[PDB]
Design a protein that fits this description.
The complex is a heterotetramer, with two copies of chain A and two copies of chain B. By secondary structure, chain A is an alpha+beta fold. Chain A has a single domain, classed as Rossmann fold. Chain A has helices at 38-48, 122-131, 146-152, 155-164, and strands at residues 2-9, 19-22, 27-32, 79-86, 98-105, 111-115, 118-120, 141-142. By secondary structure, chain B is an alpha+beta fold. Chain B has a single domain (1-161), classed as Rossmann fold (3-Layer(aba) Sandwich), CATH 3.40.50.300. In chain B, 42% of the residues lie in helices and 20% in strands. The chains are: A alpha+beta, B alpha+beta. The complex binds adenosine-5'-triphosphate (ATP) (2 copies) and magnesium ion (2 copies). It is classed as cell cycle. The entry lists the keywords SMC, ABC-ATPases, Cohesin. It forms a tetrameric assembly.
Chain lengths: 166, 161, 161, 166
């Protein structure tokens, strides 16, 4: 399966006016001035798929991912991200052409997940992602600065990485 | 353990060499083990003409390209439905960026690729371009065509005032 | 000590604000002290529209631009006969690279500047371009004109095979 | 004063066949493929002006700056760099339109300096450079990776830097 689009609402630099981000089934390039919100789109994906740590998403607290009041706009009541997955070849264990996963986080740090509408648990979502070969252990997400890290690594840490791959 | 660890290592290593050879024409790179697993994993790369040296002795740019070869090799071992790359071409030159971009365009026929780059050579190889911009602290998105994206870039390069 | 330390700090800080304001149109940046010298030196930057945040909270690219403003400010305090810059535009976008390049082109009338960059926007602003290349492990140098350098770059961007 | 050109002989990736690198009095851009020898030119300048540490020049030992035998070429017997300075406005304390500083290092790590031909001591060279406002404390040389460092710095280390500037 592949990502059709990505809806953001009050997530990091994306205001209260819901934003829709469409992707090509093939190769998509995200460009923009420095500090415009390119990496935040990456953050939205990490987040909606079971965003473990606020640190990898450069946030002190998980609650800092909520849109911060700006010039002509109040702060969000919460942060929401809904990624639409294309389920034609049936990579997931569901009987549905379209799979939608939605996550919402509140000022208190509470997070609610949704699967095609129904409420769900991170664990169920993680399991549906895993069945589609979408996992943190797949290393399919390379963050700003990760290459510079794969470099610093010592032959040791490097040998240990293939340990986990095994 | 060391029975399967070698099954994977041989699989990944096999990938690292073929990818690298593509990114570095006329060159090569092997993932030789220090203890054929008490020590570590070393990387030896050898481009066209130059001598063999451990990754840590290469130039910044060569290190970044070699590291990518490694990463790409780990992804080939366990294929994902999509990939998100944020600035993986920050140290590569126009020629090297193009090689990485052609490789990504190629694999693009089987898995989905979402690359965030500031380089023009990288975006120009994409099926779609998403331009991000900000106004009064608010991020906005707009689907930019290949021509419109280039016009903006050519304008930055013109001598204004 | 704190009598002169403030004489310099006020001099450098004054520079940081004016340079930054040039690199970030409509923006600003101050070097406020944590203890007006028991603590440290903090950096607060505020671009056009966005709120004020310490350098450590900015985006990678904004951090690199702000850091450069700082560096440039220290060089203005004690002007050198020449400067050598190696990859100072590795994280800046085409628009930002151009701003740094125009600033360097400007100061270029008083001090000498030797910048090593992989970006085309940076080299295109130079009075002279030195192309380095290697063959069989040996580095070679050749004086490349503005047109010849661009031809090579346009060729990398064409769709070959 | 300003740099007219830079002659390298057996220095790092530059072979035994002496190489001449001319510079504009204004703005010069050095370009080239990754790993071609761009930064080594920077290294040649650090070196010829009193190259303190082999580390900042990415060399285990000071002797590793000597050209390493290649395909169709033997290793250098030594590494030499001669930078030609334009002395018109008289930035230096010498009465000469052209100031030339030459440094040579041998496999044993011995280094010989030359000033406009005459032999000289690092200290005399350092002093002539200092009089021309050319010093390590001028921060006029920003190496590959330095910006990434000015970033990592903590507000402390940053306050300490202006200490040295004072
Ligand atoms: N919770 C939030 N509310 C409002 N703005 C936020 C929030 N979290 C982050 N931001 C803004 O996001 C911006 C950084 O975004 P991002 O990392 O996406 O930029 P970028 O385009 O990747 O930059 P670069 O090209 O320099 O990497 C900063 O200007 C920051 O103020
Ligand atoms: N003593 C030496 N003898 C021969 N070659 C050497 C020596 N020291 C360094 N080199 C070669 O110099 C090259 C790196 O040079 P340099 O750092 O100048 O490249 P670069 O053009 O700056 O690369 P990048 O754009 O990736 O930063 C390596 O290929 C290395 O093998
Ligand atoms: Mg970013
Ligand atoms: Mg370099």
């Amino acid at each position: 399966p592949y990502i059709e689009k990505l809806e953001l609402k009050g997530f990091k630099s994306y205001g209260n006016k819901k934003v829709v981000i469409p992707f090509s089934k093939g190769f998509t390039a995200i460009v923009g001035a420095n500090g415009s919100g390119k990496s935040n789109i990456g953050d939205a994906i990490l987040f909606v798929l079971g965003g473990l740590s606020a640190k990898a998403m450069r946030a002190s607290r998980i609650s800092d991912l909520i849109f911060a009041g700006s010039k002509n706009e109040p702060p969000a009541k919460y942060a929401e991200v809904a990624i639409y997955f294309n389920n034609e070849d049936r990579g997931f264990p569901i009987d549905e052409d379209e799979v939608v996963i939605r996550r919402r986080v509140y000022p208190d740090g509470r997070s609610s997940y949704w699967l095609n509408g129904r409420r769900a648990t991170r664990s169920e979502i993680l399991d549906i992602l895993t069945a589609a070969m979408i996992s943190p252990d797949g290393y399919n997400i390379v963050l700003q600065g990760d290459i510079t890290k794969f470099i610093k690594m010592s032959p040791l840490e490097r040998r240990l990485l293939i340990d986990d791959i095994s | 353990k060391k029975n399967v660890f070698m099954r994977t290592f041989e699989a990944i290593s096999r990938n690292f060499s073929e990818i690298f050879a593509k990114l570095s024409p006329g060159g090569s790179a092997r993932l030789i083990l220090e203890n054929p697993f008490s020590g570590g994993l070393e990387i030896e790369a050898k481009p066209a003409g130059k001598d063999v040296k451990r990754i840590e002795a290469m130039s910044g740019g060569e290190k970044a390209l070699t590291a990518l070869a490694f990463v790409f090799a780990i992804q080939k071992f366990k294929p994902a439905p999509f990939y998100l790359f944020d600035q993986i071409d920050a140290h590569l030159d126009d020629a090297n960026v193009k090689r990485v971009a052609d490789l990504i365009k190629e694999s693009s026929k089987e898995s989905q690729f979402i690359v965030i780059t500031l380089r023009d050579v990288m975006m120009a190889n994409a099926d779609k371009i998403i331009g991000v911009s900000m106004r009064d602290g608010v991020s906005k998105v707009v689907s930019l065509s290949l021509e419109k994206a280039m016009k903006i870039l050519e304008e930055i390069r013109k001598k204004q005032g």
